[PDB]
Design a protein around this ligand. Sequence first.
Ligand SMILES: Nc1ncnc2c1ncn2[C@@H]1O[C@H](COP(=O)(O)OP(=O)(O)O)[C@@H](O)[C@H]1O
Ligand SMILES: [Mn+2]
Ligand code: NA
Length: 427
Amino acid sequence: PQAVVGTGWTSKGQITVLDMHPGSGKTHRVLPELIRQCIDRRLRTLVLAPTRVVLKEMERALNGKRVRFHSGAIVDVMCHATYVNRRLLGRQNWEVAIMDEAHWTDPHSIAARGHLYTLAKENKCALVLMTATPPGKSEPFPESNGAITSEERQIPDGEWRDGFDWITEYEGRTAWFVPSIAKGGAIARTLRQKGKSVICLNSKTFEKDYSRVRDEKPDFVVTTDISEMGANLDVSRVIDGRTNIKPEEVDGKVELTGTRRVTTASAAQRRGRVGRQDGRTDEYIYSGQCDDDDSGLVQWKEAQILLDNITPVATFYGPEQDKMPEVAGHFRLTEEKRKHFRHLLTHCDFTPWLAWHVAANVSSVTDRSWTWEGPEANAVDEASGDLVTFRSPNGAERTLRPVWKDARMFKEGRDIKEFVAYASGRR
Ligand SMILES: Nc1ncnc2c1ncn2[C@@H]1O[C@H](COP(=O)(O)OP(=O)(O)O)[C@@H](O)[C@H]1O
Ligand SMILES: [Mn+2]
Ligand code: NA
């Protein structure tokens, strides 16, 4: 059991980074020991899971302990997002905070470790960050429970016919990381045409399909970064193009153009899907280098948006603090507008970026004219190339043309149809 958590780790102001390689037992071994200690010492304790799947991991890992799981117990377990979103309103307090997967660059995750770091720094609580890749450390090839042979090869970027026999002549199960759902679909179509069984994991398919992997044992799992954390794919090979889709504010809009190179922490998680078992050798096949400079991504603005509205002078976790795009408190809203912000996040599935721009600028919680009164360049097109139309309750035909344009609302795991429900005032 890691050295720095024998005792004194639970002391107000203590920040414990556990740099623990993948498969090393952060979730199923170390966490139950930290909770057993916290409960014996009667310390009110917060546990933060990135995702529902890691939360369900924790429910098994903390089976037979007095713990309350959130969607007469002093340990609260919830998702990073749940914590931050609740703090946007009679807030609860804990004196120990344990964050699992504390590398995650989801804006709720950056915001939560920022708030907890700030509290720690003011002696309000003790903080434990657990991850294979602490923020600041640049290490794509961390340690494994078993050997991984890592090799650079050219990897197909879409459909292919000949020239990559090593993909289909492999005898074990593979996980192939792809930068988008669309790129995922084209890889999966080719693999199935080559007679392979394939399950696609992404935000649209996960809750139905993740549990199928264990059972069906497909030749391939074609997955986005959704599988970077707490996903057990039980594969012997990862194929990793080392790309991701990059949400970025460009000329006042959020775009999803093109690909960025992954961060070391992402490459490590992707490689981390294999080498989980000693006495087995697994493969990690990759293409090209990593890039730890993700400062231009909208996630940092979205993290500050969330952090400024859940708060001394609050900062990001120290290593990430260079990436706060504005002076602390810049994005704080009035109470009344934070209420609107929280509604749009929790009930309308808005990005933090869009929810902030709407709540800061719009007169009423009932106004929808912002969805059609944007500049002509912001008009949203259907697949067939026609501009999306819908009807306000008075029967007026509108073209979807939002003042604030976030491409994430109209592709890659969200549908135009759900935004139209909101724009037409059905919400
Ligand atoms: N106390 C325990 N009870 C049950 N399984 C455990 C326990 N400790 C470790 N394991 C198992 O050992 C492995 C630990 O890896 P895991 O906790 O996923 O690592 P990490 O979170 O550091 O990536 C898993 O297969 C887990 O189920
Ligand atoms: Mn884990
Ligand atoms: Na399928």
